[PDB]
Amino acid sequence: GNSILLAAVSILSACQQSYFALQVGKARLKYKVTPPAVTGSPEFERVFRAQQNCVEFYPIFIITLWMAGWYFNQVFATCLGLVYIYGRHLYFWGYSEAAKKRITGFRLSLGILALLTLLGALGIANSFLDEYLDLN
Amino acid sequence: GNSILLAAVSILSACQQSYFALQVGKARLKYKVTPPAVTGSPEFERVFRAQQNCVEFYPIFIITLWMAGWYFNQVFATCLGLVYIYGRHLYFWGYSEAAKKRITGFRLSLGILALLTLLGALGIANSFLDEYL
Amino acid sequence: NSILLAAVSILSACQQSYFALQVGKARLKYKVTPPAVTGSPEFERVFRAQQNCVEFYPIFIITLWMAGWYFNQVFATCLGLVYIYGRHLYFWGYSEAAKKRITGFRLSLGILALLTLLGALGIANSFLDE
Ligand code: NA
Ligand code: NA
């Protein structure tokens, strides 16, 4: 109820995650790289690696999104979440063309993660001072 | 039970994830791939990729599982969740044998993943529309 | 509440971010060009270590929260703190030599087992009570 926006952001992100993975499938077929190999076509390795970078940061994003969303402010976290989704959109397709074209998306994505993390830390400390240290 | 069914599926799924990760460790010994190398025996590389595929799809499953479970229907999401676990079981051992034999498990697993996402989306849309009420 | 779980989760997410970025630093020192993840054995250990931390992280998070909610938060939190340290050992251990990763790995996996156990017990317990 008080987390419906976070839920929505999470579901959209999961689609993008699902999407990226399926894109790795198409590259696999398009650049005749047969499983389980992930080397061969230079084209595939960029798509695969791009996708690999997105999965490792995904749980970080989800945790920091929700911590920020729950302990600081839901609307602001959501907005940031959406920019992260776009940053990752830029990152993924950028990488597929060339390694040089991934930087903006990546930098945008990590900047957003830093801020979510920051807000989450603040909201929790703020909440900690109420329940444990009685500064109600 | 509020989320006891969802919790239960998540613990079962996490255990399978642990199993998969540890099989790759066991695989290093049987096929003699010494760390940090991940190439050599075609057998290890299939086991490695399979587990790697399970890893990249795992957070998707959990999210869609809970969103579906929380906003649409817990029992139905839970049942779908169990099928996903089995699909991955089929996928994993299938891939281990040959890349060709992963497809039933893979298709089955992603089919549930598609379905979980939908119900979660619908249930959330349903919950959002209490902006009106 | 769940404030202790929240704090641990954020502390853990920070370490995950750290590991990921270390792989970037490794690319520079050992001159590995993207998208390649092979080359220097020095780089290859760091990459694998970070990659091993990635596959166990969601496992850790779920059992942490399941343990924290269905058994006991403080106890789960304490275990969580140990897991994070275990992973600190594993990573830096692996970077030095693959042989020196074992202590960190076994400790983190032991904690993962206990969190799993505690979580399973609380969920079984709550489910049977209906
Ligand atoms: Na996209
Ligand atoms: Na994962």
Numbering used by the authors:
A (entry chain A): 3 to 138
B (entry chain C): 3 to 135
C (entry chain B): 4 to 133
Task: List passages from the publication reporting this PDB structure.
Microsomal glutathione S-transferase 2 (MGST2) is a member of a family of integral membrane proteins denoted MAPEG (Membrane Associated Proteins in Eicosanoid and Glutathione metabolism), which encompasses several important targets for development of anti-inflammatory and anti-cancer drugs interfering with prostaglandin and leukotriene biosynthesis. In non-hematopoietic cells, MGST2 catalyzes leukotriene C4 (LTC4) synthesis via conjugation of glutathione (GSH) and LTA4, a transient epoxide intermediate derived from 5-lipoxygenase metabolism of arachidonic acid. Previous studies of MGST2 have revealed that only one out of three active sites is used at a time, an intriguing catalytic behavior also observed for MGST1 and microsomal prostaglandin E synthase-1 (mPGES-1) both of which are strongly implicated in human pathophysiology. The overall structure is a homo-trimer, with each monomer containing 4 trans-membrane α-helices (αH1–αH4), forming three potential active sites at their interfaces.
The structure of apo-MGST2 (with two homo-trimers in the asymmetric unit) shows structural heterogeneity, while the structure of holo-MGST2, which contains GSH at only two of the three possible active sites appears more rigid. Specifically, the four-residue stretch (Ala101–Arg104) at the beginning of αH4, which forms part of the active site and contains the catalytically important Arg104, is uniformly observed in a 310 helical motif within the apo structure and the GSO3− complex. However, we observed significant structural differences in pore-lining residues between the apo and holo states: for instance, reorientation in the side chain of Val57 upon GSH binding broadens the cytoplasmic side of the cavity possibly increasing solvent access. In apo simulations on a membrane, the symmetry of inter-subunit interactions early breaks and the 310 helix at the active site unfolds in one unit at a time. This local unfolding is not subunit-specific, occurring in a different monomer in each replica trajectory, and is accompanied by changes in inter-subunit contacts. These conformational changes widen the central pore, allow a significant water influx throughout the inner cavity, and expose the active site to solvent. In this state, the highly dynamic loop L, which protrudes to the solvent, can trap GSH and help approximate it to the binding site.
